[PDB]
RNA sequence: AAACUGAAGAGUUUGAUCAUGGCUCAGAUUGAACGCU
RNA sequence: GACCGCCUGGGGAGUACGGCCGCAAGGUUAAAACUCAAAUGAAUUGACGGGGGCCCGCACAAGCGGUGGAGCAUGUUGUUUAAUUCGAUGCAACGCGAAGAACCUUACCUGGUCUUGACAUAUCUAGAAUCCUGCAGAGAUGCGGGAGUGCCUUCGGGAAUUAGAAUACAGGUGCUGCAUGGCUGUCGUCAGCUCGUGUCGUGAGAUGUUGGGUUAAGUCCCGCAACGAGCGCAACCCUUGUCCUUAGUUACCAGGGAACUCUAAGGAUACUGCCAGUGACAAACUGGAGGAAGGCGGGGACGACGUCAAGUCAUCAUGGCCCUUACGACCAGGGCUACACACGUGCUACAAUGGUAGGUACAGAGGGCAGCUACACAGCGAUGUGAUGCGAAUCUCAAAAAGCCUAUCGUAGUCCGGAUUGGAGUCUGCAACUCGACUCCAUGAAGUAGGAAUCGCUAGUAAUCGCGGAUCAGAAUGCCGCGGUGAAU
């Protein structure tokens, strides 16, 4: 526990906030609470389709939610009937129409959250942690990442003593502020406890 | 915090919302100098007779997500822990690490 | 420090004589960053001694008393194989002035006159002839240096 | 014609190593005993 | 190759007993029981040395100011309690979680109560929810009376909704940070930490990464069985220092102006770039010019592989264990504020470089409808009433204080200090007894510079002086910031 968040330290130099609205000092708190509610609802509902970058920007009441997923087809549904239900469920627990327009991740091996959640799903499927970690490294490296680091922390393989393991390939220079490093941290709820999964994908400058 | 304490804050705020207007009109009545002395005395007696949780003083600000009473920020409505988590994830617009 | 020798800061002279020596003494009298209070203390002392001694230019008198207070040999601790030897050495001129000014201020801080400016003027007068706690401290330091006078390492 | 056919190692000293070196084990055997059957 | 001597795990033990030798001291020959799974040799990587060499950091030294002595604030221990809730414990716990305990918070104690329950889903019975009421009670709660009949589909009816009918269950700040994730401290912003291939060694490993310099730096150069790479260093980010450009209000004022300051966006500059030397024909260092800035211009954020089974199961999440008319839940009162005591952080002082009374100046930053208040009046004051402007570069908090001029005090426990106590009030709040903060009058305690010991600081720093903000109804001497004056070494 001695490292800054890669996204947060880069929030203004090369990255952008995944929430772009403006409020007044009194309105801001309720905007933020509603935003966090929508985010947690979305991440629990669309847990099948591999969404990674839900972005909330609300211009004057009406909002424009933008989810980026690697599998837009399943979350949109047939002719677009799941997306309408999602639209109205968002609108119900926000103020007025939440236009959710859905992007597409054309390289799911370069997004850190998709890699981390894949490793997590494999871990909850009682797959060897070393093999899952190495598979993710290989997949990202041959998909074209300039660097990938993946850290697995916890009771790995049912071990009584938790340990931290990791693999790195490429550069992933955390201290460089202009590095374009995607980062994700998820948890796999195994049968022996929680295993934390951290993924750094360094893509350029 | 405990689910019971979160629901206790909720039911404490329900009475505040239910008697918000009555308190305002009664407060104007008791602070009215043109009003009769016995009238304002009786109004203050009613104010002290109102149900206890109806006061906005017994309300304790808690984190929206965790319900933590200590380490609260009004502008964000969350405790320091999850405030830091969301700022570092980038979920909180405008807010970033400061240095000067 | 441990590596380099810092370039010393420039000290602007006192406003009413234009002398960096009096400015540095005002700094030595200063406390809590009060230049005005230190300057009026020192100026009161200087005008008191000047009006008592009938001297038109008192900066030369201050130089005289300063060179009279300045020591020449100070005792320095040296280590040679576990022996602490109090070797007497010369005093570099900057340290000479600093020691003289510090001794003058600390001696004037303990006298019995009513105002601190009066105290400082009395101390300047006394060290002019060769008396006062500044003179006693200088004599004590010279006494220790001569008491050793046996280590020329 | 034949009597000419036979040879395995492991554990344990160290943070680790190689050596030394003891201890221990896997085999065969019995005029056997004991226990369960 | 010849011959001789000797060994067969470590102890017991070169010991016992018996011979032989010796004046003696003893020597020599030489067991056993028992006991232990080791005892050893050489080398390797670390760590350590009251070993050596080289180097750095307020580490010391040189200085400035403190703490340790007083009163008070705050935290902890101990004690005491019905309870004085829980955690943090060498640096790296002790103004720490807590960015603010009258109720609430609250997790503790006393008492009064509830049991699919304050909260989620499965369900079927009536009703739009919702509003106004009476009494009893400290309140939680208990028993009763009136108004309203939703909306879309319409006779299956549905997003919400009140009281249960029961099983699942919910709930748990209950335990295990030594089962964990996430987060954090710390060595330490120290300059290190590794890997691939090659080579060397039976091997653990080594080399690279060592050496000569150099640097803030494993920084860079040159050597070199190494050749390369990665994370660290640096840079990229923010702020400040000079200038230019766009712009000129609510900002500015040189002569309505578009000059200036300022505001806030985009850029320029700084690169050892030039000169002289020293240096292996190097890296680099030393000095100089120009420039606002010179070598990393100043400050910050950024914290490598790892170490402490470091901290947190009481933010949260979670494996397991445990309780389910209770360790869950609701309410009132009390406690978390007790004090023979001890310690840790501070604040105010012990005065004349000062106190007091008059005048007279000079800031920055931040806050303001969950409000700040111009002005007028009333009050000794805190404040109260009326009223005005402002969601603010407009109005306001708000006056900056230290500073300067004059008078006075004249070294006294005082015209210092302002604790403690008595009285009378103002606000906030349902409510100020436990247990608020201010105001006024009276009192006027210790304290005259602090033992052993010990701490911070290298420049706009220390020291000192005020001013804001978070939390917050009220409640900072703490925390987080801002500027003023401004050193010594």
Automatic annotation (TrEMBL), chain A:
Keyword hit for Ribonucleoprotein: yes
GO cellular component terms listed in the entry, alphabetical order: cytosolic small ribosomal subunit
Database matches in Gene3D superfamilies: 3.30.300.20, Ribosomal protein S3, C-terminal domain
Tagged with keyword rRNA-binding: yes
A GO BP annotation: translation
Database matches in Pfam families: KH_2 (PF07650), Ribosomal_S3_C (PF00189)
SUPFAM superfamilies, per database record: Prokaryotic type KH domain (KH-domain type II), Ribosomal protein S3 C-terminal domain
GO molecular function, one term: mRNA binding
InterPro entries xref list: KH_dom, KH_dom-like_a/b, KH_dom_type_2, KH_sf_prok-type, Ribosomal_S3_C_sf, Ribosomal_uS3, Ribosomal_uS3_bac-typ, Ribosomal_uS3_C
Domain KH type-2 as annotated: residue spans: 38-106
Keywords: Ribonucleoprotein, Ribosomal protein, RNA-binding, rRNA-binding
UniProt record similarity statement: Belongs to the universal ribosomal protein uS3 family.
Subunit structure: Part of the 30S ribosomal subunit. Forms a tight complex with proteins S10 and S14.
NCBIfam families hit by this protein: rpsC_bact (TIGR01009)
Function, in words: Binds the lower part of the 30S subunit head. Binds mRNA in the 70S ribosome, positioning it for translation.
Protein's name according to its UniProt entry: Small ribosomal subunit protein uS3
Organism: Psychrobacter urativorans
Gene encoding the protein: rpsC
Automatic annotation (TrEMBL), chain B:
GO cellular component assignments: cytoplasm; small ribosomal subunit
UniProt GO MF annotations: rRNA binding; structural constituent of ribosome
SUPFAM superfamilies: Glucocorticoid receptor-like (DNA-binding domain)
Keyword annotations of the record: Ribonucleoprotein, Ribosomal protein, RNA-binding, rRNA-binding
Superkingdom to which the source organism belongs: Bacteria
Example of a GO biological process term: translation
Gene3D superfamilies per UniProt: 1.10.287.1480
Family annotation (PROSITE patterns): RIBOSOMAL_S14
Function: Binds 16S rRNA, required for the assembly of 30S particles and may also be responsible for determining the conformation of the 16S rRNA at the A site.
Subunit and interaction comment: Part of the 30S ribosomal subunit. Contacts proteins S3 and S10.
Entry similarity comment: Belongs to the universal ribosomal protein uS14 family.
Protein's name in the database: Small ribosomal subunit protein uS14
UniProtKB/TrEMBL annotation, chain C:
Domain Small ribosomal subunit protein uS7, chain residue ranges per copy: 1-149
Function, in words: One of the primary rRNA binding proteins, it binds directly to 16S rRNA where it nucleates assembly of the head domain of the 30S subunit. Is located at the subunit interface close to the decoding center, probably blocks exit of the E-site tRNA.
Pfam families linked: Ribosomal_S7
Keyword RNA-binding: yes
SUPFAM superfamilies the UniProt entry points to: Ribosomal protein S7
Protein name, as recorded: Small ribosomal subunit protein uS7
Annotated GO MF terms: rRNA binding; structural constituent of ribosome; tRNA binding
Lineage top rank: taxon: Bacteria
InterPro entries: Ribosomal_uS7, Ribosomal_uS7_bac/org-type, Ribosomal_uS7_CS, Ribosomal_uS7_dom, Ribosomal_uS7_dom_sf
Keywords: Ribonucleoprotein, Ribosomal protein, RNA-binding, rRNA-binding, tRNA-binding
Signal peptide: none
GO cellular component: small ribosomal subunit
Species, as recorded: Psychrobacter urativorans
Subunit structure: Part of the 30S ribosomal subunit. Contacts proteins S9 and S11.
GO BP annotation list: translation
Family: Belongs to the universal ribosomal protein uS7 family.
CDD domains according to UniProt: uS7_Bacteria
């Amino acid at each position: 526990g001695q490292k800054v968040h890669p996204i947060g330290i880069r929030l203004g130099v090369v990255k952008k906030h995944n929430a772009n609205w403006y409020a007044s000092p009194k309105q801001y708190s309720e905007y933020l609470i509603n935003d966090i509610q929508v985010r947690e609802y979305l991440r629990k509902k669309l847990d099948s389709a591999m969404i990674s970058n839900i972005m909330i920007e609300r211009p004057t009441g009406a909002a424009k939610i933008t989810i980026a997923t690697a599998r837009p087809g399943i979350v949109i549904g047939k002719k677009g009937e799941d997306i309408e239900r999602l639209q109205k469920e968002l609108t119900k627990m926000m103020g007025v129409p939440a236009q959710v327009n859905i992007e597409e991740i054309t390289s799911p091996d370069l997004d850190a959250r998709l890699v981390a959640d894949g490793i997590g799903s494999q871990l909850e499927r009682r797959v060897m942690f070393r093999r899952a970690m190495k598979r993710a490294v290989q997949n990202s490296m041959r998909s074209g990442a300039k660097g990938i680091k993946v850290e697995l922390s916890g009771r790995l393989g049912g071990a009584e003593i938790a340990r931290t393991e990791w693999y790195r390939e490429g550069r992933v220079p955390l201290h460089t502020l202009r590095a374009d490093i995607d980062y994700a941290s998820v948890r796999a709820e195994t049968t022996y406890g929680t295993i934390g999964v951290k993924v750094w994908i360094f893509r350029g400058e | 915090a405990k689910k019971s304490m979160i629901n206790r804050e909720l039911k404490r705020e329900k009475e505040v919302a239910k008697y918000a207007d009555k308190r305002t009109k009664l407060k104007e009545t008791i602070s009215d100098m043109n009003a009769s002395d016995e009238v304002r005395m009786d109004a203050m007696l009613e104010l002290q007779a109102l149900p206890r949780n109806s006061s906005p003083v017994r309300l304790r600000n808690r984190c929206a997500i965790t319900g933590r009473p200590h380490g609260y920020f009004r502008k964000f409505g969350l405790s320091r822990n999850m405030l830091r988590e969301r700022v570092m994830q980038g979920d909180v617009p405008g807010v970033r690490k400061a240095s000067w | 420090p441990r590596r380099r020798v810092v370039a010393t800061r420039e000290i602007l002279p006192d406003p009413k004589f234009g002398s960096q020596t009096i400015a540095k003494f005002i700094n030595h009298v200063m406390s809590h960053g009060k230049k005005s209070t230190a300057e009026r203390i020192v100026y009161g002392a200087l005008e008191t001694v000047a009006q008592k001694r009938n001297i038109e230019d008192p900066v030369a008198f201050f130089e005289d008393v300063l060179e009279n207070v300045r020591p020449m040999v100070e005792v320095k601790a040296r280590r040679v194989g576990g022996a602490t030897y109090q070797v007497p050495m010369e005093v570099r001129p900057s340290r000479r002035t600093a020691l003289a000014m510090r001794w003058l201020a600390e001696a004037a801080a303990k006298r019995s006159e009513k105002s601190m400016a009066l105290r400082l003027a009395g101390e300047l007068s006394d060290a002019s002839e060769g008396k006062g706690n500044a003179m006693k401290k200088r004599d004590e330091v010279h006494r220790m240096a001569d008491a050793n006078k046996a280590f020329s390492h």
